[PDB]
Write a protein that binds this ligand. Structure first.
Ligand code: ROC
Ligand code: ROC
Lengths: 99, 99
């Protein structure tokens, strides 16, 4: 699709076998999902946002299906206000900014 | 331009004689730039993101060139680690997210 930015670019994702929504975020280097369980071992990390750094669990090689397109990569879990899909996964769906 | 996301989508911006860089940020409602203090009246306000909230000064009707395109709108000024071009000015420059 071609998504205009009149409103927040939310799409349906599927992760851990569950449907959720998430924000497609060209400004985010990483993908971060609201607290949930995921398989495999995780490592503790910190990541910084506009208001300071948060603690998160980093999971590797996680499958997300983003608006019907498959992506696999690192997914952080931590206290985010909203699930965000950042550039590490947006590149695998060929997403681009056009103007 | 059709911009892929293998790296951060930074562009040159010009606000009032000052040449700066900023991140085209689909995941941001607002435009936030670390600046001296633009001309005109402002009002204080708190904006947030991952990690909590920062204090900004809100300026309306700011004229800023973004990647060679003219936009006029609200610009928030305060202590952001990275300057960001949010959706309120992305729509003015005709930016869309595509995949
Ligand atoms: C709406 C309300 C009754 C307050 N319920 C909740 O907020 C529950 C409470 C639960 C316990 C606390 C931890 C989170 C869970 C899940 N949340 C809902 C959570 O799963 C759901 C995710 C979502 C967002 C947008 C579109 C679809 C789905 N978020 C929400 O319902 C709330 C309300 C809203 N205005 O959208 N959204 C947000 O809180 C939120 C905050 C910042 C954002 C920035 C950009 C884009 C979206 C943003 N959404
Ligand atoms: C997600 C993460 C990997 C942590 N990356 C980032 O957070 C980087 C950090 C960078 C350096 C500091 C300044 C921002 C840049 C770009 N961001 C991405 C950037 O896209 C970030 C993603 C985001 C969206 C919604 C909620 C929280 C976080 N957006 C933002 O920080 C924008 C800023 C703004 N316009 O006010 N926030 C929001 O648009 C927004 C909207 C509603 C909200 C409700 C409750 C709490 C926070 C809310 N934030």
């Amino acid at each position: 699709p071609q998504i205009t930015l009149w409103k927040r670019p939310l799409v349906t994702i599927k992760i851990g076998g569950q449907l959720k929504e998430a924000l497609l975020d060209t400004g985010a280097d990483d993908t971060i999902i609201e607290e949930m369980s995921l398989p495999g071992r995780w490592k503790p990390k910190m990541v910084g946002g506009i208001g300071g750094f948060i603690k998160v669990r980093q999971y590797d090689q996680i499958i997300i299906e983003i608006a019907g397109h498959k992506a696999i990569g690192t997914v952080l879990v931590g206290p985010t206000p909203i699930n965000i899909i950042g550039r590490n996964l947006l590149t695998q769906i060929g997403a681009t900014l056009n103007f």
